[PDB]
Amino acid sequence: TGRPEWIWLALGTALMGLGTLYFLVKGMGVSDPDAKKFYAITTLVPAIAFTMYLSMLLGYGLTMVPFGGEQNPIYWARYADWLFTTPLLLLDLALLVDADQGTILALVGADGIMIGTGLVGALTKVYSYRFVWWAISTAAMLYILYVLFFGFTSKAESMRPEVASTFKVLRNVTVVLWSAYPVVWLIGSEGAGIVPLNIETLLFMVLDVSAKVGFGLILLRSRAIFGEAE
Amino acid sequence: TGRPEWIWLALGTALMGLGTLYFLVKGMGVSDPDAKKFYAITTLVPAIAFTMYLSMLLGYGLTMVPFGGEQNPIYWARYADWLFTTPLLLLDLALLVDADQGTILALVGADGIMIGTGLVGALTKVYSYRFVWWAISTAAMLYILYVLFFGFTSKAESMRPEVASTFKVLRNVTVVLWSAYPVVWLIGSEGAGIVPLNIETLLFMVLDVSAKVGFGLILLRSRAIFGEAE
Amino acid sequence: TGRPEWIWLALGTALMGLGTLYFLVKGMGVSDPDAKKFYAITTLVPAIAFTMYLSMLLGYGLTMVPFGGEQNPIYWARYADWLFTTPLLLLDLALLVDADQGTILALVGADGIMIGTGLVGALTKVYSYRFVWWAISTAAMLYILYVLFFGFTSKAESMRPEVASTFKVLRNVTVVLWSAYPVVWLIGSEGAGIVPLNIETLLFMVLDVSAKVGFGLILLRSRAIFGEAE
Ligand SMILES: CC(C)CCC[C@@H](C)CCC[C@@H](C)CCC[C@@H](C)CCO[C@@H](CO)COCC[C@@H](C)CCC[C@H](C)CCC[C@@H](C)CCCC(C)C
Ligand SMILES: CC(C)CCC[C@@H](C)CCC[C@@H](C)CCC[C@@H](C)CCO[C@@H](CO)COCC[C@@H](C)CCC[C@H](C)CCC[C@@H](C)CCCC(C)C
Ligand SMILES: CC(C)CCC[C@@H](C)CCC[C@@H](C)CCC[C@@H](C)CCO[C@@H](CO)COCC[C@@H](C)CCC[C@H](C)CCC[C@@H](C)CCCC(C)C
Ligand SMILES: CC(C)CCC[C@@H](C)CCC[C@H](C)CCC[C@@H](C)CCO[C@@H](CO)COCC[C@H](C)CCC[C@@H](C)CCC[C@@H](C)CCCC(C)C
Ligand SMILES: CC(C)CCC[C@@H](C)CCC[C@H](C)CCC[C@@H](C)CCO[C@@H](CO)COCC[C@H](C)CCC[C@@H](C)CCC[C@@H](C)CCCC(C)C
Ligand SMILES: CC(C)CCC[C@@H](C)CCC[C@H](C)CCC[C@@H](C)CCO[C@@H](CO)COCC[C@H](C)CCC[C@@H](C)CCC[C@@H](C)CCCC(C)C
Ligand SMILES: *C/C=C(C)/C=C/C=C(C)/C=C/C1=C(C)CCCC1(C)C
Ligand SMILES: *C/C=C(C)/C=C/C=C(C)/C=C/C1=C(C)CCCC1(C)C
Ligand SMILES: *C/C=C(C)/C=C/C=C(C)/C=C/C1=C(C)CCCC1(C)C
């Protein structure tokens, strides 16, 4: 309770934990192989986030980085979360549209570059260089957003309407929520330091629960996750 | 030789190295694609363990963690081993039964959570919180054990008898040996400290060689690893 | 500019960045799923290397390792690069020949052992033991080279001539360039220290740009990356 942001770390831990349990229960019983892949992906995402929220809450996932002459509290565990959960979210989208394997590779690899350069920026001790990593990471994010909108152009032919509809909704959820993360980091504790860590943590908690549990609720309620069967 | 547990680290290095060489030789010549996947998986497992045993033996894979007011010797290299070798062992089981891809994802991701939360527990400086990570990791292990027993329920129909027989044996080997690891950690150097590090290292060496080389000997001697062919 | 090797780190950053941009543009428009996988793999390789070259240039990817009684500058970011880019290069080769999945596993796992034991050697504080890790890593490299020459022996039957021709060329490029890396490390800053870090950095920059951008130019100009189509 000693860090003011504890309350949002606690709330994020609880909501990710409850979302995980909900999705775990919800997928109990499903047999359809296509649906099993979406439940597995979609349940792992908040499970991983639960563990990394808890590590921040307990202090394990926090480190001090000197930059600006100051000792700056940097929650590194966010990058260990996102390293796994953001490619998993992209895989859910990619599987929905039956993406080609080359496209999945491009997406997962650009996402790794996005998170790994964000982690390097988050831990860089020369203040000005932190924003160079932010820019490179943002370029990788823009590439991902580009592929999500313009990289499935051969798939439209042979896409079930309900898959098309659930994919468009989740793609729009993804583009809006993910695009807010570079802005929060830029103005927050890792970047310019104009928004305090307390509020930054709240913002990422709202984004994360929305991008993982809210995304997952929309996907897992959809018929698009089942193969078409008589 | 300065740490009493060196002898078990040396013995573990040698047995993993010899098991690797044996499996490498044994799979020389196999053409069958199914069998090649099992030899590859099963040979990599003790090869990786050989390197991490050697890193503990040479001291690289040891760190001191303050907790309990004391400086506690924690062999972190075990988690770098298990991060790769325990999903590989699960993949051998999963391939045997032709598991659905969603099930393999669930298994590999729960296993990553199990090892990563065990690593966080192993390095946590607040003593009481180490057991919170142990509990979460144990929950993930129990999920894996649950899936190995109740998650292949559509596969029984179309399973060759020899695959069914080798899978049941290896599944039983896996459930018994893996379940001992949380107990050893709980009573050993990472947990309550009731069993000294010397004996703990012996116990994990016996478990590891059994779970990797003993498992691999049973699998690789089986006809279940070959596709059925005239 | 304070470290004499900065100029090769700068040149390597620029050439990897320009190679990435070139391959990104070059693959704009390709529809063929086979070709998309090769463009994705082959574009990610210099993109990742660009980020790790930049991290060395900016100092983030450098650490000091005590060994020999001295504080030795070790660029660890090379291992974070190679951890991802060397399996990706192997995947390009493997996909060219339609390798069996067991063979791809063997290659990617031996490559992980090669890079992870090279990283352990690079950070080991007992000088003599650094060469033990070098030897183990070299054994893994020799295994990979062995598989590239003798592990596709069932694939020769059903291999298009242009795939066979591009694969032989890239395989020869790979064996020659990769084999130089253990020699550079052995005589350079990480090993015996007979070649200064400045020259070592130049050597790895020439190898890396050749093994990534030069390799990629040969592959991506080939018809072998397209499925055979009327
Ligand atoms: C899915 C859910 C039930 C998760 C609920 C949210 C939760 C994890 C975080 C909320 C913290 C909350 C209790 C706030 C008040 C603090 C308080 C207790 C007293 C203050 O008092 C103080 C004074 O400084 C702090 O106490 C010590 C530390 C604790 C407060 C933190 C404990 C860790 C957690 C509560 C989480 C435990 C994880 C488990 C789910 C493990 C089981 C795994 C498995 C079976 C799948
Ligand atoms: C597959 C096998 C042959 C492995 C055999 C077991 C072994 C790796 C560990 C046993 C240690 C043992 C010799 C005990 C006595 C110590 C002693 C030498 C003297 C004591 O004297 C002392 C005094 O404190 C310590 O010596 C210095 C360190 C060494 C003892 C340790 C050296 C490392 C290893 C012996 C392993 C080397 C790895 C290789 C396989 C590399 C090749 C890779 C490739 C070709 C695939
Ligand atoms: C693809 C290319 C355009 C890459 C070009 C090469 C380059 C990255 C490295 C060359 C350094 C060079 C300018 C040498 C002179 C130094 C100098 C400026 C003055 C010396 O003056 C000094 C005194 O000590 C140092 O300056 C401070 C640091 C900088 C010199 C380094 C800045 C980082 C880089 C220049 C790279 C930026 C990365 C971007 C591509 C981000 C955008 C991502 C996205 C849109 C895809
Ligand atoms: C968020 C992101 C930036 C992260 C992206 C990925 C990331 C984790 C990068 C990792 C690269 C690298 C380790 C960097 C080190 C930095 C540093 C300063 C020191 C680190 O930290 C230290 C300091 O004490 C220890 O590291 C050395 C040991 C290793 C970390 C573990 C060794 C592993 C092996 C030798 C075993 C072989 C593994 C394989 C077989 C894997 C293949 C799987 C297969 C079987 C299919
Ligand atoms: C046992 C477990 C807990 C481990 C589970 C996974 C694990 C390794 C978690 C890693 C997350 C994270 C790095 C945590 C950092 C903690 C910390 C305090 C600081 C670390 O350690 C430090 C301290 O000096 C350095 O880290 C920063 C640099 C990075 C480690 C490496 C950067 C990688 C990239 C920028 C390149 C892009 C990579 C991708 C392209 C990968 C995608 C593959 C593709 C091409 C298909
Ligand atoms: C170049 C090579 C040697 C590297 C090869 C791989 C490598 C990165 C090895 C990593 C092992 C290990 C982390 C070693 C730690 C060393 C040390 C001294 C301390 C480190 O560094 C520290 C010091 O502060 C922090 O580490 C602990 C936290 C973790 C690093 C991150 C935890 C991750 C999780 C708990 C979440 C679960 C992840 C999974 C779900 C992944 C599965 C994917 C799925 C969903 C499909
Ligand atoms: C589950 C959490 C999700 C969906 C997180 C998304 C994170 C991002 C899109 C992060 C992007 C970043 C940048 C583009 C620039 C650097 C800072 C980051 C890593 C916050
Ligand atoms: C090759 C080595 C094998 C099979 C290792 C298995 C390791 C485990 C099943 C570890 C489990 C753990 C817990 C469930 C709780 C926390 C402590 C661990 C990581 C030892
Ligand atoms: C893109 C960069 C490439 C192709 C790098 C290749 C790196 C190697 C083949 C590294 C090999 C090493 C050894 C065999 C011994 C230990 C030192 C290393 C890691 C340099």
Numbering used by the authors:
A (entry chain A), B (entry chain A), C (entry chain A): 5 to 234
Give the text the authors published on this PDB structure.
In the case of bR, the retinal chromophore forms a Schiff-base (SB) linkage with a lysine residue at position 216 (Lys216). Retinal takes an all-trans conformation in the light-adapted resting state. The light absorption causes the isomerization of a double bond at C13−C14 of retinal from a trans to cis conformation. In the reaction cycle of bR, a single proton is transported from the inside to the outside of the plasma membrane.
